[PDB]
Every structure is written in structure tokens, then in C-alpha cells.
Design an enzyme around this catalytic site. Structure first.
Site, PDB file in Angstrom:
ATOM      1  NE  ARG A 191      64.907  49.662  13.998  1.00  0.00           N
ATOM      2  CZ  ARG A 191      65.598  50.214  15.003  1.00  0.00           C
ATOM      3  NH1 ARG A 191      66.644  49.640  15.628  1.00  0.00           N
ATOM      4  NH2 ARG A 191      65.223  51.402  15.417  1.00  0.00           N
ATOM      5  CG  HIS A 202      66.120  52.634  10.487  1.00  0.00           C
ATOM      6  ND1 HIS A 202      66.127  53.232  11.675  1.00  0.00           N
ATOM      7  CD2 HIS A 202      64.942  51.943  10.360  1.00  0.00           C
ATOM      8  CE1 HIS A 202      65.013  52.933  12.274  1.00  0.00           C
ATOM      9  NE2 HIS A 202      64.305  52.160  11.484  1.00  0.00           N
ATOM     10  CG  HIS A 232      57.197  45.522  12.016  1.00  0.00           C
ATOM     11  ND1 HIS A 232      56.526  46.644  12.274  1.00  0.00           N
ATOM     12  CD2 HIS A 232      58.524  45.889  11.954  1.00  0.00           C
ATOM     13  CE1 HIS A 232      57.382  47.642  12.389  1.00  0.00           C
ATOM     14  NE2 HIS A 232      58.594  47.173  12.191  1.00  0.00           N
ATOM     15  CD1 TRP A 270      54.752  43.647  15.588  1.00  0.00           C
ATOM     16  CD2 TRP A 270      56.998  43.276  15.788  1.00  0.00           C
ATOM     17  NE1 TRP A 270      55.352  44.813  15.672  1.00  0.00           N
ATOM     18  CE2 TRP A 270      56.681  44.641  15.776  1.00  0.00           C
ATOM     19  CE3 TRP A 270      58.316  42.857  15.697  1.00  0.00           C
ATOM     20  CZ2 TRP A 270      57.671  45.603  15.664  1.00  0.00           C
ATOM     21  CZ3 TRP A 270      59.302  43.818  15.586  1.00  0.00           C
ATOM     22  CH2 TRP A 270      58.989  45.168  15.569  1.00  0.00           C
TER      23      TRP A 270
HETATM   24  C1  HEM Z   1      55.760  53.187   9.850  1.00  0.00           C
HETATM   25  C2  HEM Z   1      56.805  52.203   9.691  1.00  0.00           C
HETATM   26  C3  HEM Z   1      57.616  51.674  10.702  1.00  0.00           C
HETATM   27  C4  HEM Z   1      57.758  52.025  12.041  1.00  0.00           C
HETATM   28  C5  HEM Z   1      57.086  53.106  12.870  1.00  0.00           C
HETATM   29  C6  HEM Z   1      58.618  51.062  12.577  1.00  0.00           C
HETATM   30  C7  HEM Z   1      59.071  51.033  13.909  1.00  0.00           C
HETATM   31  C8  HEM Z   1      59.848  50.058  14.552  1.00  0.00           C
HETATM   32  C9  HEM Z   1      60.205  50.072  15.886  1.00  0.00           C
HETATM   33  C10 HEM Z   1      59.786  51.092  16.928  1.00  0.00           C
HETATM   34  C11 HEM Z   1      61.022  48.947  16.064  1.00  0.00           C
HETATM   35  C12 HEM Z   1      61.724  48.489  17.340  1.00  0.00           C
HETATM   36  C13 HEM Z   1      63.145  48.970  17.504  1.00  0.00           C
HETATM   37  C14 HEM Z   1      63.832  48.425  18.764  1.00  0.00           C
HETATM   38  O1  HEM Z   1      63.422  48.704  19.889  1.00  0.00           O
HETATM   39  O2  HEM Z   1      64.824  47.710  18.668  1.00  0.00           O
HETATM   40  C15 HEM Z   1      61.083  48.314  14.837  1.00  0.00           C
HETATM   41  C16 HEM Z   1      61.844  47.153  14.559  1.00  0.00           C
HETATM   42  C17 HEM Z   1      62.029  46.496  13.333  1.00  0.00           C
HETATM   43  N1  HEM Z   1      61.574  46.968  12.164  1.00  0.00           N
HETATM   44 FE1  HEM Z   1      60.121  48.466  11.963  1.00  0.00          FE
HETATM   45  N2  HEM Z   1      58.923  50.138  11.674  1.00  0.00           N
HETATM   46  C18 HEM Z   1      58.427  50.554  10.513  1.00  0.00           C
HETATM   47  C19 HEM Z   1      58.698  49.939   9.290  1.00  0.00           C
HETATM   48  C20 HEM Z   1      59.542  48.856   8.990  1.00  0.00           C
HETATM   49  C21 HEM Z   1      59.837  48.420   7.700  1.00  0.00           C
HETATM   50  C22 HEM Z   1      59.337  49.066   6.398  1.00  0.00           C
HETATM   51  C23 HEM Z   1      60.762  47.387   7.879  1.00  0.00           C
HETATM   52  C24 HEM Z   1      61.411  46.556   6.958  1.00  0.00           C
HETATM   53  C25 HEM Z   1      61.091  46.323   5.566  1.00  0.00           C
HETATM   54  C26 HEM Z   1      60.920  47.246   9.255  1.00  0.00           C
HETATM   55  C27 HEM Z   1      61.720  46.270   9.872  1.00  0.00           C
HETATM   56  C28 HEM Z   1      61.970  46.103  11.229  1.00  0.00           C
HETATM   57  C29 HEM Z   1      62.589  44.996  11.791  1.00  0.00           C
HETATM   58  C30 HEM Z   1      62.998  43.717  11.086  1.00  0.00           C
HETATM   59  C31 HEM Z   1      62.653  45.259  13.153  1.00  0.00           C
HETATM   60  C32 HEM Z   1      63.238  44.340  14.236  1.00  0.00           C
HETATM   61  C33 HEM Z   1      64.690  44.680  14.605  1.00  0.00           C
HETATM   62  C34 HEM Z   1      65.248  43.937  15.815  1.00  0.00           C
HETATM   63  O3  HEM Z   1      64.725  42.894  16.184  1.00  0.00           O
HETATM   64  O4  HEM Z   1      66.211  44.405  16.393  1.00  0.00           O
HETATM   65  N3  HEM Z   1      60.200  48.153   9.926  1.00  0.00           N
HETATM   66  N4  HEM Z   1      60.330  48.969  13.937  1.00  0.00           N
END
Ligand code: HEM
Length: 291
Positions: free
Chosen positions: A45, A49, A172, A188
Site C-alpha cells: 500500500r 500511495h 486488495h 477482503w
Molecule cells: C480506486 C483505488 C483504490 C482505493 C479507493 C483504495 C482504497 C483503500 C482503502 C480505503 C484501504 C484501507 C486503508 C486502511 O484502513 O488501512 C486500502 C488498503 C490497501 N490497499 Fe487499496 N485502494 C485502491 C487501490 C489500490 C491499489 C492500486 C493497490 C495496490 C497495487 C492497493 C493496495 C492496498 C493494500 C495492499 C491495502 C491493505 C493495507 C493494510 O492492510 O494495511 N490499493 N485501499
């Protein structure tokens, strides 16, 4: 803006393989973080970002400048929770002070996908730290409360097409949402620190119910105890995105090949590589080295 990749002076493949090994050994060691999910998910993540701020129109943002180290970007509301990944990598940067911030943050993402049994991601070195006034303003990262048209339009700014957007969202399968970071809560899937095509299989096979959570946000919840953000569920509402979701649900190898290409593109947007520059490195896993 032009951002020319410049190799850290005097460093070769073997130097970078030592930084990869240091990140991967510490992933093994700190396995207790976030109820035993480990730091692998927050590190990919973090790599998305710091890359996701890029704007194709004026070449600002992106991974090159390592500007997340500055207060403005570090404290962006959309980056809440990433301080954990920063703190993980900080001892590794004291150990290898020669590596640039953008190279360390992006490499953390590569190391994490491969150590979690994901595909090999070719990685290029050469990002150069840029000054505090090159830091992008807050507001360039995507909202979760939106639809397929917003997602398509958003990813056009990073010139990612439909297949690249659906492949990238497959990350995700990893980790979870946290109520205090984002206003959403839950995983997820079940295997959330192993890289698989589980996100697509869950999106196609679960009985999803729309509900409001404790932060007053909507999310799709299943009997199994899993969740989907409005933007994830968008991928089965749009006809073009749905044919690609079905493809990856039926073929994990095709998902791995496409994720590998799209994630490298995301981490390299905005960077010009001279052809005197080294070819992309393919790092060995701890397992491949006997470590
Ligand atoms: C429209 C696109 C995306 C949106 C709106 C989005 C949104 C989010 C949100 C709201 C979280 C939770 C954050 C938290 O509460 O800790 C999250 C987590 C995460 N995202 Fe996404 N995401 C998007 C795209 C992506 C992409 C492109 C990647 C990676 C190639 C990604 C990888 C991750 C990962 C691995 C987590 C988990 C992090 C953790 O467990 O702490 N996301 N995302």
C-alpha cells in the site's frame, strides 16, 4: 518537468539485493503486526500511495522524488496508517544510507509481493530525492465511496487502462481495511498475507450485502465475514471490468503476469530512463538464496 533516473553512485545489482534481503528478513521477523497479518500488505500500500500521486499532464508527483518523507504528504488524510510502513523501513534506511527514499519505498513494495509468494516484479533503480517544495498537494489519491466511472477516470491520470486497473486492484486480496485509518472495516478475504487471485473469486462468489458501518460509510459485506469497498464492487457492475475479473478468477497465472507489468509501470511513471542505465533487476527471494 523531466525526472532523469540517476543510479546511486557506484552501486550494482548485488548492493540492491542486500537491501531486498534486509527488508525480507525483517518481514519474517516482525510477523505479529496487525493480528499476525505481518507488514507485507502495508508495504505494498505504501509503494502504491507514493506512486499514485502522479499526474501525466505536468509530470508532477509519482515515486521519483521520495516526497512522502515531507510533512505535507506524510500527514495527508489518505495516507493514514502508512506511518507504520515508514517506521518499518527506517532501520533499513539507517543500515543502507546510500539508497534514495523513492528507491527504498518502491523496493519495499516489490520485496513484499515476492516474499508473499507473488510474481517476480522487475524493478529499476535511479529515483533521486527532490526538495520539500516538489511535494504534491493533498487530494490526488482516490476516494473509496465511488463508482466504476470515477475509477476509470481516476486511473486515466496515471494512464492506466481497464486491464491495468483490474490487475492492480487484485492487490486488495492483501491485508484489510481499518476503521480508524479510513472509515472502513474488515478484510477482503481469508488468505490475506499470501498473494493469490482470491479478490476476484470472492467478488464473483460471495453473497454481498450493502450495509452501513460504524463510521457511517457504506460497504458490501458477506456472510463469510469479508468486505468490499464501493470502488471494488464497481468492478462487477461495469461490463468491461467484469469480463477481466472473470478472466483473473479463472486464471491466476494470467493475473500474475498482468499484475507484474502494471505494478512496475505504476512504480516507474514519471521517470525517464537513459539507455546507458542498467536493465531492470529481478531480485531473488530469501528462499531462492537459502536464507
Ligand atoms: C480506486 C483505488 C483504490 C482505493 C479507493 C483504495 C482504497 C483503500 C482503502 C480505503 C484501504 C484501507 C486503508 C486502511 O484502513 O488501512 C486500502 C488498503 C490497501 N490497499 Fe487499496 N485502494 C485502491 C487501490 C489500490 C491499489 C492500486 C493497490 C495496490 C497495487 C492497493 C493496495 C492496498 C493494500 C495492499 C491495502 C491493505 C493495507 C493494510 O492492510 O494495511 N490499493 N485501499
Amino acid at each position: 518537468l523531466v525526472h532523469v533516473a540517476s543510479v546511486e553512485k557506484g552501486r550494482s545489482y548485488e548492493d540492491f539485493q542486500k537491501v531486498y534481503n534486509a527488508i525480507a528478513l525483517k518481514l519474517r521477523e516482525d510477523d505479529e503486526y496487525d493480528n499476525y497479518i505481518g507488514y507485507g500488505p502495508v508495504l505494498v500500500r505504501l509503494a502504491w500511495h507514493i506512486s499514485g500521486t502522479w499526474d501525466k499532464h505536468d509530470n508532477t508527483g509519482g515515486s521519483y522524488g521520495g516526497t512522502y518523507r515531507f510533512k505535507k504528504e506524510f500527514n495527508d488524510p489518505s495516507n493514514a496508517g502508512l506511518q507504520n510502513g515508514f517506521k518499518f523501513l527506517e532501520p533499513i534506511h539507517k543500515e543502507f544510507p546510500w539508497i534514495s527514499s523513492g528507491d527504498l519505498f518502491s523496493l519495499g513494495g516489490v520485496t513484499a509481493v515476492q516474499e508473499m509468494q507473488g510474481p517476480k516484479i522487475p524493478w529499476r533503480c535511479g529515483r533521486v530525492d527532490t526538495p520539500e517544495d516538489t511535494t504534491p498537494d493533498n487530494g490526488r489519491l482516490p476516494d473509496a465511496d465511488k463508482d466504476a466511472g470515477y475509477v476509470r477516470t481516476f486511473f486515466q491520470r496515471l494512464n492506466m487502462n481497464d486491464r491495468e486497473v483490474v490487475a492492480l486492484m487484485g492487490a486488495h486480496a492483501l491485508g484489510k481495511t481499518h476503521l480508524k485509518n479510513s472509515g472502513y472495516e474488515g478484510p477482503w478475504g481469508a488468505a490475506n498475507n499470501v498473494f493469490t487471485n482470491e479478490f476476484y473469486l470472492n467478488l464473483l462468489n460471495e453473497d454481498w450485502k450493502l450495509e452501513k458501518n460504524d463510521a457511517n460509510n457504506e460497504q458490501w459485506d458477506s456472510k463469510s465475514g469479508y468486505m468490499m469497498l464501493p470502488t471494488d464492487y464497481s468492478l462487477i457492475q461495469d461490463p468491461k471490468y467484469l469480463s477481466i475479473v472473470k478472466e483473473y478468477a479463472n486464471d491466476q497465472d494470467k493475473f500474475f503476469k498482468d499484475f507484474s507489468k502494471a505494478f512496475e509501470k505504476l512504480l516507474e511513471n514519471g521517470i525517464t530512463f537513459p539507455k546507458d542505465a542498467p536493465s531492470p533487476f529481478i531480485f531473488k527471494t530469501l528462499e531462492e538464496q537459502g536464507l
